[PDB]
């Protein structure tokens, strides 16, 4: 069973490569771990909504070549609905290298072709009748506009992951969403205000009837509810970041499927943050993502601290 | 028809993300193209043998994965013989990315699982004796060095691309080759002298009946015959090095059927010059290997320069 959440979003091969010292410059690093991934924003948002008992769907894109043969086959095996996946005739998938350092700190080189989400995907509403939540990042905005506003039409969580992207693409998504999930950059650059505490009241009173909160990694996450301006913060759990490549990923897959279970939001809020918070305790983008009950029972422990 | 050539060794799916600046340190560069191509020594001077008109055949490892299943589909694709290639059950097949700056110049990142090679690979005088020739490289020296003995003993060109490796692993196959072309890191290494025509005198006198070339890319290719002290020197064409990726490969492979075909010495190195020079003007690794008529053209308007 489990709540049913469509996510909708990026889907990447990426090839992460563990090196002790990051590279400075021609010549040559030797890893000594590799890990070939299918994730991305969406991807690994559905894979967290799976690990964390729910049911996921992804609709994403990936072109008709073998890395999204490959991509389509590490998301289905990974617990991914992935049977409303676009092939984009034409497009190649997305990948990208990222050397992670011993210092958790990364050097991206992403492949990227916008041929991928240049055709219309169909959105009906009884295409998303049968999820309890829908969750969008801001790779595919054509296709997430319309998710999101079919799914609020229906009373159901539309929720926006509101990462970097043009500010004309967070403005354009933002007023469809029941629910939106910034991350630190985002928020700066919508808000053009430096500390997270202060961007609550203003993003707020741009979207008064939308849940708000903005995530601050080991910082935390401030929010406000809809239709108040009261500011809420939740610290998080504490622990040492090896890789927090995902973590943001793993936090918005938990709390849209805390939405369609319909828990209160302070308790969405610590169940995502600590779900996050074990993710970045291991090496491998979203391999990390925890189980439902390593993340209650991490919980629990870390709300009787001292 | 064409002579055929086994080529044995490197078999590796390179990424290659072409840049404006390399990275010097952690973030994010975006590229402006990007290559997937299975290439390594052997595969490549594989390649090269087909573009100049032989037939080729690899033996090479890749592993039972997504990453073999598609070095072995190119390899074919592009004219070269698979057929041999071994499946080394529980390894993982080769990969690298390689990002190449607008000065040509590379940061490579590699990986590799030595248990690609740790199983014996047959090489009977029946195999051997279906070939013409036989080039290999360092990457798999326990079959190179069987490959070479054989070939050799068929009175066969036996030929050893002597690049970077272990010293010990150098020494090991020189002694089995009839024939050794040498890059300039290599017989640096192997002799300690710094420059390359210093270099001829000491190799040749440790191997006195073997055909002794040190290439040194736009400076040349310096040479001894078998049996004779007497150095030799074959000046290149000069082009612009857009990349110089998989260089030395097109002219071991050239090199390797101009022998196949019995050629003279300085004509061979002349045509595996222009071969790898003309490779050198198109970016992509081995992409740019030549047709034969194209550096048969590009020679004789060389040979008539002024
Ligand atoms: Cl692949």
């Not at 490569?17 to 040559?28: I, L, N, S, T, Y």
């Not at 999820?131 to 969580?157: H, I, S, Y």
């Not at 929720?159 to 629910?179: F, M, Q, R």
């Not at 979207?207 to 080991?218: D, E, K, L, N, S």
């Amino acid at each position: 069973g489990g709540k049913h959440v469509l996510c909708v979003g990026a889907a990447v091969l990426d090839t992460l490569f563990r090196v002790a010292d990051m590279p400075k410059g021609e010549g040559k690093v030797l890893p000594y771990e590799v890990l070939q991934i299918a994730e991305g924003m969406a991807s690994s948002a559905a894979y967290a909504v799976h690990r964390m008992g729910g049911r996921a769907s992804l609709w994403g894109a990936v072109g008709d070549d073998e890395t999204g043969t490959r991509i389509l086959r590490d998301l289905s095996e990974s617990g991914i609905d992935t049977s409303g996946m676009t092939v984009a005739p034409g497009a190649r998938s997305a990948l990208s290298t990222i050397i992670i350092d011993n210092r958790g700190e990364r050097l991206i080189v992403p492949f990227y072709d916008h041929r991928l989400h240049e055709k219309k995907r169909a959105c009906t509403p009884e295409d998303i009748a049968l999820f309890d939540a829908v969750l969008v990042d801001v790779r595919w905005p054509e296709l997430a506009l319309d998710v999101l506003t079919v799914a609020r039409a229906l009373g159901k969580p539309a929720i926006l992951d509101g990462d970097v992207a043009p500010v004309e693409t967070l403005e354009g998504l933002a007023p469809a969403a029941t629910h939106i999930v910034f991350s630190e950059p985002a928020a700066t650059r919508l808000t053009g205000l430096e500390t997270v505490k202060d961007m609550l009241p203003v993003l707020h009173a741009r979207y008064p009837q939308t849940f708000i909160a903005v995530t601050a990694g080991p910082a935390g996450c401030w929010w406000t509810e809809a239709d108040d301006p009261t500011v809420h913060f939740q610290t998080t759990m504490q622990v040492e970041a090896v890789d927090t490549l995902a973590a943001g990923d793993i936090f918005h897959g938990t709390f849209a499927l805390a939405m369609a279970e319909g828990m209160q939001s302070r308790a969405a809020v610590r169940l995502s943050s600590v779900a996050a918070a074990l993710k970045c305790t291991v090496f491998g983008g979203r391999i990390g993502a925890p189980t439902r009950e390593e993340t209650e029972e991490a919980m629990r422990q870390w709300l009787e601290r001292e």
